[PDB]
Amino acid sequence: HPLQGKVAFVQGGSRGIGAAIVKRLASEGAAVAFTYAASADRAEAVASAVTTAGGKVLAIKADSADAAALQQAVRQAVSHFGNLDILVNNAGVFTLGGTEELALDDLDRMLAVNVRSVFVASQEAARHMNDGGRIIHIGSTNAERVPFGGAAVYAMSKSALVGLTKGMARDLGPRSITVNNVQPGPVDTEMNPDAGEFADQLKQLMAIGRYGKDEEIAGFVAYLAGPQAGYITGASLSIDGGFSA
Amino acid sequence: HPLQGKVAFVQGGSRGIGAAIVKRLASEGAAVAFTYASAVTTAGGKVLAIKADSADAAALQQAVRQAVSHFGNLDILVNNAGVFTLGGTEELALDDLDRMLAVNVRSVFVASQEAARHMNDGGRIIHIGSTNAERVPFGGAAVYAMSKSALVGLTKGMARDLGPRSITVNNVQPGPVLMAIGRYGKDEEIAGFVAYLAGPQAGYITGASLSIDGGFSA
């Protein structure tokens, strides 16, 4: 239990990668608060997965586009569990449009969820974090490699996390808080499943020829949140099957 | 002991980070051969120390073969040799250029090729590079940074070559063992990152240059 006694907040913990992260951190001993945007049934299941196994959990409904909701969710977690040790920013919207086509509303939505709300959750969490803490953003390998059209604004919103991570590491380093950007490739989830011709085309671009598994991303995030990772900070860390080689 | 039954080779394993990597992989259950013909081991033990200078290719290829004779095909190779000589562009001696090219660049490839010829599918190759591949704030480090940035293209192309065997290839970039965190790193922190990459949770990480540098390169 390398995270015994620690308190984690996961923004976007109800499905796929975020569910695996919440379960992973609780299995290592942390108390976990998480936000979910859509399904109280789905969040109840993740919360039960944590507690059937003997872990402590708070689920919080919050729209990641709404900054006040995210600030409120961090304070409600702190009232529940005390000051945070770990923050994982896993909200995301993955949405396609060429440069000449994308709607202004879809731009403003990916900016709000994937960029703005990562900063807003990070600032409130840091206000209520212990020294020695961990902030982990979940970016994308599309910050580094964009092989196809239609991903310009998605890739912009993910490459924004590279400069945020460097700068936040410089701000929070004197408090021994690390800040890192995890850049996944394709991961088998129920809205991006390893099945179909698009998945087969992405695999051809990868060195490993298979999608990642939710649990593999959770295992990297738990390592970075743990007591052996206090020297890793400011970094953009690819876990993408070689997509960006 | 998730490395129970697995076999690792560490090039440069006798002190500091290299020792810490040997001790962490053995503590997780691995057989470990490392370089630092002469060898020492313990009866009933699974750590074998082999004397080999990292500039000498034939001694490296033999050491790998020795390790495979004792333990079977490799699962893990860690390339941790390294030489660091300071010198400005105008002054650095060519002998010192050639020492850093042989140790930091050439022998990393020679060991990787021999290990790839005797490695199980699903294996792991981990190079130990440097944060100076990304950030070189002062003079005197040009050829050292040149030798460490070489690992970035080596890692990418080796990940493409060996991916079909499910072997991952990554480049760990340490800082000192300009900082964002206000302390140097510990040998055991580098070893913990190499052990994670070398283990069964890390099969999706390949081709990457992964900084563990206290925010030196931020």
Side-chain angles (χ1 to χ4, degrees):
Chain A
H1 295 80
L3 306 179
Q4 200 45 260
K6 297 292 179 176
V7 176
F9 189 97
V10 180
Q11 178 181 182
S14 73
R15 50 185 69 253
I17 289 167
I21 290 170
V22 166
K23 288 161 54 182
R24 191 42 189 269
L25 297 172
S27 83
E28 303 201 346
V32 182
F34 69 95
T35 63
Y36 67 93
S39 180
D41 283 338
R42 189 70 181 270
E44 167 148 280
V46 171
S48 291
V50 173
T51 57
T52 195
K56 306 171 153 178
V57 70
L58 172 72
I60 303 172
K61 184 167 184 176
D63 175 0
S64 288
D66 176 343
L70 293 172
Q71 303 169 315
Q72 288 163 185
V74 170
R75 286 191 310 262
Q76 291 171 242
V78 172
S79 290
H80 205 254
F81 286 137
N83 295 312
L84 305 183
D85 299 291
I86 293 151
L87 169 64
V88 183
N89 294 304
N90 187 56
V93 171
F94 176 61
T95 285
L96 295 174
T99 299
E100 290 189 57
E101 298 123 279
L102 188 78
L104 174 53
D105 289 347
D106 284 303
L107 162 71
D108 283 339
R109 153 130 203 283
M110 279 181 281
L111 290 176
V113 178
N114 298 0
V115 186
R116 183 175 188 253
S117 291
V118 173
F119 182 74
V120 171
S122 293
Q123 166 172 81
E124 193 62 29
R127 289 172 176 164
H128 303 277
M129 183 164 282
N130 291 317
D131 276 25
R134 309 283 189 257
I135 298 175
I136 301 159
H137 307 309
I138 306 306
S140 176
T141 195
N142 288 321
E144 277 181 31
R145 183 184 186 185
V146 185
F148 301 112
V153 166
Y154 181 71
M156 176 174 74
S157 77
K158 294 299 188 179
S159 66
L161 300 180
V162 170
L164 179 66
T165 293
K166 289 169 178 290
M168 286 182 58
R170 292 272 177 219
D171 289 341
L172 299 176
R175 317 189 33 211
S176 303
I177 291 164
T178 68
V179 185
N180 295 291
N181 170 35
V182 171
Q183 295 179 326
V187 171
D188 197 358
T189 70
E190 183 178 2
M191 282 288 296
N192 176 34
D194 192 337
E197 291 300 300
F198 175 58
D200 276 1
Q201 298 179 321
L202 294 180
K203 293 179 280 181
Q204 290 174 43
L205 294 176
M206 299 164 62
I208 312 279
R210 65 132 177 118
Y211 271 33
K213 318 279 183 43
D214 52 10
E215 45 99 30
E216 284 175 310
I217 310 307
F220 192 34
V221 172
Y223 165 81
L224 295 170
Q228 306 200 22
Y231 197 63
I232 303 171
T233 191
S236 289
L237 300 166
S238 295
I239 171 164
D240 75 349
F243 185 93
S244 62
Chain B
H1 301 89
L3 314 185
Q4 195 50 60
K6 302 279 190 260
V7 178
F9 189 93
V10 178
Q11 179 179 0
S14 72
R15 61 191 140 72
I17 284 165
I21 290 162
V22 168
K23 183 180 167 156
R24 182 57 57 85
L25 303 173
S27 86
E28 291 191 14
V32 189
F34 66 93
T35 61
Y36 74 99
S38 173
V40 59
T41 193
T42 65
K46 292 164 73 169
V47 178
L48 170 70
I50 298 169
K51 273 194 173 174
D53 183 76
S54 278
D56 182 352
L60 285 180
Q61 292 162 328
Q62 279 280 324
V64 173
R65 288 193 306 261
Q66 267 173 196
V68 173
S69 179
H70 283 87
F71 302 131
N73 279 324
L74 306 183
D75 306 289
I76 299 151
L77 168 60
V78 185
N79 292 310
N80 184 60
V83 164
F84 168 91
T85 303
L86 278 171
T89 300
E90 272 192 67
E91 62 177 12
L92 191 76
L94 295 196
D95 279 356
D96 290 326
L97 165 71
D98 281 349
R99 180 71 176 160
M100 281 186 278
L101 286 184
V103 181
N104 296 357
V105 181
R106 187 187 191 253
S107 285
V108 173
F109 180 81
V110 170
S112 297
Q113 169 174 82
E114 190 71 23
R117 286 170 174 165
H118 306 289
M119 177 169 282
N120 294 316
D121 282 15
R124 303 281 189 259
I125 296 180
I126 301 156
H127 307 307
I128 307 302
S130 178
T131 195
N132 289 337
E134 282 195 20
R135 171 120 141 241
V136 183
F138 309 112
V143 168
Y144 179 72
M146 174 183 73
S147 78
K148 298 296 200 179
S149 64
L151 302 184
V152 169
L154 177 71
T155 292
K156 295 167 174 290
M158 281 187 59
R160 291 286 183 201
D161 281 350
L162 302 181
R165 287 161 73 181
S166 297
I167 287 169
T168 67
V169 187
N170 289 296
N171 177 25
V172 172
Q173 294 181 324
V177 166
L178 296 159
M179 312 291 291
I181 58 149
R183 66 163 174 98
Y184 272 29
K186 301 170 163 82
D187 298 334
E188 29 272 301
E189 289 177 302
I190 313 305
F193 194 27
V194 168
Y196 172 74
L197 299 173
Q201 297 204 87
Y204 196 47
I205 303 173
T206 195
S209 289
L210 299 162
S211 292
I212 173 162
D213 69 358
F216 184 93
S217 64

